[PDB]
């Protein structure tokens, strides 16, 4: 399952960079560079809402992800799928990861990343395949 594995790496790496403030083929690298630019921008422009969403979420710890998975499924339950919703969910994942690290500097981002990746890949498998996976993400968010 190359798609699952590729998606978890991109999403995990972003969340870890965001939470820790450190950055460590070329297709995955383009995806991560796109996600940094777009994801950082979502967070910057939606600071107030993300703060409100975080408050409501009331996440207890690094493993407390079932509520977020329910949120993500509910997001798509109107039958619309698009990259803006997808990157927004990942950006909020990053925003949550930063908060977890604040309360406990030893928290791991993996349960969150895995939770988000599971929703996207499992529930939107064929949509992602038709988009040519992360190549579609890169293309959609391509700016000159």
């Amino acid at each position: 399952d190359d798609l699952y594995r590729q998606s978890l790496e991109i999403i995990s790496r972003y969340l870890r960079e965001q939470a820790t403030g450190s950055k460590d083929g070329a297709a995955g690298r383009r995806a991560l560079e796109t996600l940094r630019r777009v994801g950082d921008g979502v967070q910057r422009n939606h600071e107030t809402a993300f703060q409100g969403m975080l408050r409501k979420l009331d996440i207890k710890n690094e493993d407390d992800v079932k509520s977020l998975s329910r949120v993500m499924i509910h997001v798509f339950s109107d039958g619309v799928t698009n990259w803006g919703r997808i990157v927004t969910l990942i950006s909020f994942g990053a925003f949550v990861a930063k908060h977890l690290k604040t309360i406990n500097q030893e928290s791991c981002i993996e349960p969150l990343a895995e939770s988000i990746t599971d929703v996207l890949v499992r529930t939107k498998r064929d949509w992602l395949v038709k988009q040519r996976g992360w190549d579609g993400f890169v293309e959609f968010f391509h700016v000159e």
Binding site: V38, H46, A49, G52, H74, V75, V80, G84, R85, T88
Partner: peptide, 23 residues
């Protein structure tokens, strides 16, 4: 309702972001 409120917010932002880049 909290989970629905969060979802409503995330959807609004996601559709706004989608529109911005699609235009």
């Amino acid at each position: 309702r909290p989970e629905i409120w969060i979802a409503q917010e995330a959807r609004r932002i996601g559709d706004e972001a989608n529109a911005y880049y699609a235009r």
